[PDB]
Specification:
Layout: E1 4-8, E2 14-18, E3 27-31, E4 35-38, E5 57-58, E6 66-67, H1 70-89, H2 96-110, H3 134-150, H4 167-175, E7 179-182, E8 188-193, E9 201-202, E10 208-213, E11 216-221, E12 230-233, H5 242-253, H6 260-264, H7 268-271, H8 276-294, H9 298-309, H10 321-337, H11 340-357, H12 363-378, H13 382-399, H14 405-422
Parallel strand pairs: 9-12
Antiparallel strand pairs: 1-2, 2-12, 3-11, 4-8, 5-6, 7-8, 10-11
Helix pairs in contact: 1-2, 2-3, 3-4, 8-9, 8-10, 9-10, 10-11, 11-12, 12-13, 13-14
The structure holds S-adenosylmethionine (SAM), the ligand NCCS(=O)(=O)N1CCC(NC(=O)c2cc(C3CC3)on2)CC1, magnesium ion (2 copies) and zinc ion (ZN) (3 copies).
PDB class: transferase/transferase inhibitor
Keywords: methyltranserase, oncology, inhibitor, transferase, TRANSFERASE-TRANSFERASE INHIBITOR complex
Assembly: monomeric
């Protein structure tokens, strides 16, 4: 009995709406990908199959796919068999979108009908072809030729593609339907297509949220929702100004956002507090920090972050979004490096900015608060840790739910912390 249904919206194409009233935290849909792959930065760092970090065993046929276990290498083999011959035939490694579309084609040609397409299929996806600028068309033509080069060993002619399959159109669909898969710690680790979930239109203040548990996607309501009300998710990172959202929503998704937040530049001024010269430099440095982070080089991430957070030169308020991103990278680097006191220093500083920039129930705040409460618990700060773990649970019961394994870990921390308070 589905609680959601496809419908034709007035000015946003197809959408998803509530069949019945929905309450915060209600599970609305869950889905494996139609196709997914590890991202360029996480390649060789996380398992190709389960998307969990580490050493990894390489496929000896292609030496590109890496796995956490024999179970994962063997289980991945059917969906890897055909791309394996392509990865071997090409030291060149394809763009993520090309490896993704390869797996789309193989799944559609060789796999049983996918539950991921239950409400909406890859064939159905929006392409926005009549909104593409010439520069985007040129980029898509390059992706098509990259695909044809990469796949030459396994796809020679059109009989090896789905009926009336057009590669240009397929990449156009990929551009505006790609989901950024994040691990439990909210690190981007992959990209996937989830065609049923692709029905959800975007809002900068959405009433639903998606969370990933490995490649598996949970869709949950994060607000009360009335019968027939349209379901929305935020396609974008919350730590973005309306100008940045405008550029991404145009470039990637070919639409102009009419929401209250965009009409009022909601929070932009707070996000850009501090000295423009300083945060412009921090924004520029974040390109390298995030690239270093995408490749899990935590020591180099921390060094760059410390040079900003404890700079001898002018500094930024923690509510400035570029400063805040630097604090988050520093916290995660310290966690992965075992520098738990320093991790807590940075994490605690993010708490009030996160409260402001992740209103309501957002999985990124839930995870962040959980990390801080876990750090406080390990340092013996039981009453402080309990408050944060309870807050993390209030959020993550809505954004993650019992179906997400991270909720089980949080429950164990709550139980450990409460036992400590009771023994105190
Ligand atoms: C993942 S699809 C969402 C479902 C889509 N409406 C469809 O018909 O298949 C993303 C595309 O939906 C449209 N879209 C999503 N959110 C929108 C919004 N808030 N306003 C206008 N168009 C939107 C844009 O065409 C965008 O590229
Ligand atoms: N570290 C970042 C964690 S995040 O939760 O903020 N995040 C940022 C937003 C991201 N969302 C998407 O990729 C996405 C794509 C779509 C439709 C298909 C176009 O809908 N959502 C998930 C990860
Ligand atoms: Mg269409
Ligand atoms: Mg259109
Ligand atoms: Zn694995
Ligand atoms: Zn291989
Ligand atoms: Zn908006």
């Amino acid at each position: 009995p589905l609680k959601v249904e496809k419908f034709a919206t007035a000015n946003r194409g197809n959408g998803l709406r509530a069949v019945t009233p929905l309450r915060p935290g209600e599970l609305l849909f869950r889905s494996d990908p139609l196709a997914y792959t590890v991202c360029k930065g996480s390649r060789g760092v996380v398992c190709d199959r389960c998307l969990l970090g580490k050493k990894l065993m390489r496929c000896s046929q292609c030496r590109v796919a890496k796995y956490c276990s024999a179970k994962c290498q063997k289980k991945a083999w059917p969906d890897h068999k055909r791309e394996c011959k392509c990865l071997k035939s090409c030291p060149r490694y394809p763009p993520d979108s090309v490896r993704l579309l390869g797996r789309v084609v193989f799944k559609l040609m060789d796999g049983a009908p996918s539950e991921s397409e239950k409400l909406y299929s890859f064939y159905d996806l929006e392409s926005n072809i009549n909104k593409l600028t010439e520069d985007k068309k040129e980029g898509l033509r390059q992706l098509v030729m990259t695909f044809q080069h990469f796949m030459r060993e396994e796809i020679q002619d059109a009989s090896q593609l789905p009926p009336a399959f057009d590669l240009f159109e397929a990449f156009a669909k990929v551009i505006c339907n790609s989901f950024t898969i994040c691990n439990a710690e909210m690190q981007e680790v992959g990209v996937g297509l989830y065609p049923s979930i692709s029905l959800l239109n975007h809002s900068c203040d959405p009433n639903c949220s998606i969370v990933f548990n490995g490649p598996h996607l949970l869709l949950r309501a994060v607000r009360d929702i009335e019968v027939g009300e349209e379901l929305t998710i935020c396609y974008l990172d919350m730590l973005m100004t309306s100008e940045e959202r405008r550029k991404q929503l145009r470039d990637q998704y070919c639409f102009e956002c009419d929401c209250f937040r965009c009409q009022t530049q909601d929070k932009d001024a707070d996000m850009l507090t501090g000295d423009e010269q300083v945060w412009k430099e921090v924004q520029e440095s974040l390109k390298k920090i995030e690239e270093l982070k995408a490749h899990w080089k935590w020591e180099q991430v921390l060094a760059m972050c410390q040079a900003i957070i404890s700079s001898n030169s002018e500094r930024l308020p923690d509510i400035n979004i570029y400063q805040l991103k630097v604090l988050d990278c520093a916290m995660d680097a310290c966690i992965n490096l075992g520098l738990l006191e320093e991790a807590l220093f940075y994490g605690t500083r993010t708490m009030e900015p996160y409260r402001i920039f992740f209103p309501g129930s957002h999985p990124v705040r839930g995870v962040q608060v959980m990390k801080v409460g876990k750090l406080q618990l390990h340092q013996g700060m039981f009453p402080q840790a309990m408050k944060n773990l309870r807050l993390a649970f209030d959020i993550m019961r809505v954004t993650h739910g019992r179906e997400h394994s991270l909720i089980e870990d949080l429950i164990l921390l709550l139980e450990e912390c409460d036992a400590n308070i009771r023994a105190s």
